[PDB]
Structures are given as structure tokens and as C-alpha cells.
């Protein structure tokens, strides 16, 4: 991989789930280093309007917000994660 993970500092390879901090620092992170669920990653990364912000740093989601929003979506309590911005 070209980029190192914002959290653990090890390389991000193409076969690992990874998310870019587009809110600001523009660093790539392994999904598993952030604590983001597989569910949130799937929903966040497909949603063109949403961006992710790392713990140090168009609708912005932190990990915990993305996690909480996806749980609500999947329980049928919200229409998309954008509702949680
Ligand atoms: C290792 O330091 C970080 C920096 C940013 C960050 N963002 C997260 N969601 S976990 C995390 C950990
Ligand atoms: Zn990492
Ligand atoms: Zn950041």
C-alpha cells in the first residue's frame, strides 16, 4: 500500500477495508482501527453525500455517529444514515 493508517501507522493495502478522513486530515485509516462496524462502513462508503471524520478532526460523520446511525437504519428506525448528521 501507498498510504499509512492514521491510527496504527502501518500500511493500508488494497485488500483491507479502509476509510479516508475527508473531513480534514485526508489520512486513510483501516476500518478495524477506527472501531467502525462492517455495517456502518457499508452504509457510509456508498453514501456520496457523507464524509467521515477521524477522532482528531456534505454531511460529516464520526465513527461513533456512523455506528449509531447504521444501527438505527438496520433496525428500521431511520430512513438513511444522513438523518443522523
Ligand atoms: C491512533 O490515533 C487515532 C487517530 C484517529 C482516530 N480516529 C478514529 N476513529 S480511531 C483513531 C485513532
Ligand atoms: Zn490501522
Ligand atoms: Zn482526520
Curated annotation (Swiss-Prot):
Subcellular location as annotated: Nucleus
Ranges annotated as PHD-type zinc finger: 2-57
Subunit structure: Binds to BCL9 via the PHD-type zinc finger motif, and thereby becomes part of the nuclear beta-catenin/TCF complex.
Known function: Involved in signal transduction through the Wnt pathway.
Record's protein name: Pygopus homolog 2
Organism from which the protein derives: Homo sapiens
Chain's gene name: PYGO2
Residues of the full protein shown: 327 to 382 of 406
